[PDB]
Amino acid sequence: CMFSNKTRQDSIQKMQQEELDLLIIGGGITGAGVAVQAAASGIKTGLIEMQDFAEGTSSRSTKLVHGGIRYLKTFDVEVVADTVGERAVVQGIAPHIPKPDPMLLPIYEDEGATTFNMFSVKVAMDLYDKLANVTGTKYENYTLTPEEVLEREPFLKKEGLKGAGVYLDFRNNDARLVIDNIKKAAEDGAYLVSKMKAVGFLYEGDQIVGVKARDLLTDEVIEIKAKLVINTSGPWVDKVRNLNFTRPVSPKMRPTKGIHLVVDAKKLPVPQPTYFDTGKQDGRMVFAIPRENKTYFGTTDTDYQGDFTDPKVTQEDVDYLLDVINHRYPEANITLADIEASWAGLRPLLIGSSLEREPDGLLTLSGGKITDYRKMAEGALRLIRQLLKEEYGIETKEIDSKKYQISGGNFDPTKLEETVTELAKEGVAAGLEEEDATYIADFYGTNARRIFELAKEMAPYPGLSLAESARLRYGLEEEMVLAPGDYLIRRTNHLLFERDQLDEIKQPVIDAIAEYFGWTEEEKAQQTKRLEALIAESDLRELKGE
Amino acid sequence: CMFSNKTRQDSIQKMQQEELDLLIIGGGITGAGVAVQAAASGIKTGLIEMQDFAEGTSSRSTKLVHGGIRYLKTFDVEVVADTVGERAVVQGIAPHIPKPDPMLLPIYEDEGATTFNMFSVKVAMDLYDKLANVTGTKYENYTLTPEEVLEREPFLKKEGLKGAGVYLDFRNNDARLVIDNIKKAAEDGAYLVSKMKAVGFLYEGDQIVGVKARDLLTDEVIEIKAKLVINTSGPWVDKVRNLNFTRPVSPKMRPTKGIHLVVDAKKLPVPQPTYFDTGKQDGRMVFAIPRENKTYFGTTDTDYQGDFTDPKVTQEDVDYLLDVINHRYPEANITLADIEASWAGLRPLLIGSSLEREPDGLLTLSGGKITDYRKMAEGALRLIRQLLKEEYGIETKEIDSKKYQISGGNFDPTKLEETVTELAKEGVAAGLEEEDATYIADFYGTNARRIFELAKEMAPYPGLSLAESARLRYGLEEEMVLAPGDYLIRRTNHLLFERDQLDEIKQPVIDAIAEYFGWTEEEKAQQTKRLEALIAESDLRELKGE
Numbered sequence A, B: 001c002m003f004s005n006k007t008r009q010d011s012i013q014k015m016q017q018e019e020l021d022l023l024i025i026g027g028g029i030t031g032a033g034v035a036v037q038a039a040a041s042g043i044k045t046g047l048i049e050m051q052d053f054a055e056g057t058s059s060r061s062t063k064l065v066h067g068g069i070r071y072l073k074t075f076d077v078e079v080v081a082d083t084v085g086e087r088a089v090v091q092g093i094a095p096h097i098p099k100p101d102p103m104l105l106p107i108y109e110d111e112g113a114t115t116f117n118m119f120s121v122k123v124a125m126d127l128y129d130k131l132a133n134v135t136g137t138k139y140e141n142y143t144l145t146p147e148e149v150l151e152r153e154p155f156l157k158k159e160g161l162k163g164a165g166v167y168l169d170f171r172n173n174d175a176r177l178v179i180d181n182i183k184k185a186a187e188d189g190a191y192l193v194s195k196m197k198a199v200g201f202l203y204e205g206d207q208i209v210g211v212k213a214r215d216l217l218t219d220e221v222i223e224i225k226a227k228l229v230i231n232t233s234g235p236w237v238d239k240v241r242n243l244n245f246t247r248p249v250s251p252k253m254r255p256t257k258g259i260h261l262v263v264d265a266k267k268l269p270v271p272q273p274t275y276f277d278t279g280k281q282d283g284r285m286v287f288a289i290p291r292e293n294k295t296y297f298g299t300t301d302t303d304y305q306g307d308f309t310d311p312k313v314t315q316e317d318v319d320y321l322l323d324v325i326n327h328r329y330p331e332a333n334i335t336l337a338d339i340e341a342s343w344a345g346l347r348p349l350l351i352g353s354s355l356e357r358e359p360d361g362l363l364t365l366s367g368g369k370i371t372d373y374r375k376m377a378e379g380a381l382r383l384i385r386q387l388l389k390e391e392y393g394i395e396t397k398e399i400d401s402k403k404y405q406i407s408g409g410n411f412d413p414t415k416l417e418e419t420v421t422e423l424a425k426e427g428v429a430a431g432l433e434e435e436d437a438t439y440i441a442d443f444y445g446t447n448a449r450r451i452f453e454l455a456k457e458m459a460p461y462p463g464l465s466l467a468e469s470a471r472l473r474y475g476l477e478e479e480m481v482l483a484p485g486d487y488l489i490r491r492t493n494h495l496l497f498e499r500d501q502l503d504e505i506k507q508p509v510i511d512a513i514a515e516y517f518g519w520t521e522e523e524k525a526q527q528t529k530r531l532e533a534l535i536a537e538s539d540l541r542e543l544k545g546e
Ligand SMILES: Cc1cc2nc3c(=O)[nH]c(=O)nc-3n(C[C@H](O)[C@H](O)[C@H](O)COP(=O)(O)OP(=O)(O)OC[C@H]3O[C@@H](n4cnc5c(N)ncnc54)[C@H](O)[C@@H]3O)c2cc1C
Pocket: A025, A026, A027, A028, A029, A030, A031, A048, A049, A050, A051, A052, A053, A054, A055, A056, A057, A058, A059, A060, A061, A062, A063, A064, A065, A066, A196, A197, A198, A199, A232, A233, A234, A235, A236, A240, A256, A257, A258, A259, A299, A300, A344, A345, A346, A347, A348, A367, A368, A369, A370, A371, A372
């Protein structure tokens, strides 16, 4: 009853009846973070997202919160300083999301110029730690001799190995970070509508005072009045600005594509995130990263033109990434045939982040990275509060976003294990396996409680376990799942990181969702056909010649 | 009687009668440092220098021992690490030479791209300190607001001023560092001859086993046999190698010229070394540095061709440097007319330092910087010992150059003031003004004692004070002064940093030296004519149109 299709319909109607203080365009991490800070400050807030929440770039990143340690090679210390400081801030407000996962960075001497050597990587990590106040911490950096490295990863290229550095950085489920931000703002009374696209502006003089939005489920278009409209559409930032035709819009964005590939862990069983120069002397570094029972690689950097909602993996990208990986791991012999899942996204690159008011009144928050996200929203709020005070003489609350914990993260950021262990008991008590109880505690954090409540008093959907049925029900009832892909792709890691177990639950999931919505056989068939398209896409069936 | 023209004549003869274990070519800081380590290890050592000691690049530097903090902008941490570590090592073995003189580095925002800003300069200085183990020290870095900077230097460009950083680095009298190295090696029994040029090699098969050297005072050429010959001729490194004609000698050096200009302090009274971007956006930084009662600027960087012994200041160099200085100090209005002294030198640039054995057996130690000098000689000794052991089965002592104190520096590197204060008393007791006693204590360190002894039992030369006569006598008797320029230029700061008091003692100095040597009226006139040439050169009389 909290955040579902019904809630959405309520919000759609409410947004047409009352003038909002702020209308947000874009339901990615940027807009999600602004929405959370606005609602918590006591501001009539609305947010429209044409796709599912996080379906943009916020669910296509490398899935970590890091500080960009490579930028220290050119001495961009302020950029690196701001980012690593936010690393701990985000951990503090979303303890169940970003988790510490020390990086292993091997150095070679037989591949030409490198980002670091044995000596400079040590200095780099010490500075990295200093800027992050990690220097004393247990996550304090250190180095490893070639032998010690080969211990952790005996399949790594031995030729040229000079050793490695091990420093702290965070693995992070980006889609979840966005959703569990959205859910907070909702809990704080904001109107949040997915599947709604901004398609034109409402004007008073030359000033924007609302938007024409198309309900993408009914195709009906409504008017939404608002005192302030802020554009947080990521790589779509210019397309939204260009809805206004007053003057030549100078482009502020120039998005590049990056892809990622997933393989079963056994084929390349890195025990921890591994980062290194490509060996191609192209000025790039690539990862190999464990997640559940897979490792995944990227990434990739190409100029892009075309559909922004569905960027695709090309054989050029696969050749490059697999060329890099097989060079670094001489005996893994990985090919397209081993790829279980994949994904591609567009970087919202400027020309870090930018906050602008344009002549027509439109506010735009662009660029940046997921890690910077709540620092970006803070700047936006500072200006939004000022503008509300100025132009509408309306006062608002001052909050401390660095301490405002999002949905499911309302617990001591220092006690993740104790909180998971404690919640895992309630789950076993709700009637679930200890394994599933723990996974759910760690994944949804505090929200696991609600999931367990639903598990205790419900009958599992046909073809699904009680644990799985509880999660799906929760997603449908409190995470605005509208399509099976939202759930299998975005609310969970089924598609990307559990592909070998997807086929067993795919249909049962669609059945239960179509059941919950009361779909026609027409709609259920349309939804099914679409899911298959998304799966075939991630599976790279076309590149495999299937 | 210790180190004079007589000593030199003795060495010239000894070098023709006994086969040396090592013959060094070049009496700059590099060869001086190798000579000190060789002799202290118990190695029959000889060194020939065609000019006066340090008359090469070692007396034409910016006269400081620093770590090249600018190199941190490109993250060359190992290069910067080695240098700043040696900073303290050299201070420890020559406590009377290099002294701490915190740098003031102002930052501007209105001159385009800069090496640092307010934020990065702080990070840079903290790293600089860390690498040097200065972090806790009283010399720990810090920043200053524009106002605080304007306090120290009210004549600095105020427009664009964002503040400044203050970190530790050392002022250093390079010529003295070289001489007080030479004097140690002498004291440890090495043969050291100035005014002697290596002009060809002595061969056994295709192997060098000595050199033909020309006594530049008599023009007689002698043969010197040696088991090992090492080339430490700075920017002259290729010219020495090319004495052998066996094959196409690929150039390893490519020297560039840099100049410095001196003005009376009153015209630009920086209270401490000041370093900044030129504002020209040429990727360069310039100093303004106090020394005695002047400030001096540089420096400069031009490809060079011509006579290596006498590189000259050009109006192009003066225009550039004065353009930079007047831009940084809007109201100083400095022109050539205000220049009291100047000097130019050639950087021994490779293509840091290099140690090679070539096919004909010649050893070459090139590149580097004054600060690296004893670390460079250590590497050279490691190889020289090995070679002596190998090819001649001769064993040698192992010494710790990081703790071997040079001439006049045999005291606790932590007690400079107490040592100066204590020595200043002996000088007053020897019959000298307290001012002169202190200056002499600080300048010659422990050697001041000998100077005072000579002052107590001698009559001042005509036209010179007792203090001045004692120094000159010491230079002649124990610092191998052969020409007035050695003394006025190199043993002391008369020419460069006391130009307004030179004319009063110039003639009296020549008289006393000609007297001490028993010059003909022919020679004294030749020496006089030459000194005038050197003075006219530093005075830039030709550029001034005089
Ligand atoms: C390959 C790759 C790897 C990356 N790696 C990392 C990393 O490891 N760590 C990190 O911090 N960052 C990383 N980044 C960048 C980071 O993911 C992005 O900066 C971040 O997700 C941008 O968030 P956003 O909210 O601005 O945009 P998005 O998430 O793209 O959302 C914009 C939203 O607005 C919607 N929208 C567009 N037009 C309209 C409209 N007219 N009406 C209504 N809604 C609309 C879109 O559907 C979309 O959901 C990576 C990026 C890429 C491409």
